[PDB]
Design a protein around this ligand. Sequence first.
Ligand SMILES: [Zn+2]
Ligand SMILES: [Zn+2]
Lengths: 51, 7
Amino acid sequence: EPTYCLCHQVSYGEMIGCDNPDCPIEWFHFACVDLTTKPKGKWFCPRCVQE
Amino acid sequence: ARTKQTA
Ligand SMILES: [Zn+2]
Ligand SMILES: [Zn+2]
């Protein structure tokens, strides 16, 4: 039943992981982070980039 | 980037 992302909903569809090991969210739904295809290289979520 | 498909 765990929830993730900035939307705090259960996992579904394609999800991307934040590369900051101290990220409190860790996983996000592609659409919630405006992703259609997985990006190339490391990826950091909005929260960690603007921390 | 690391991604996964919800099972
Ligand atoms: Zn989401
Ligand atoms: Zn993060």
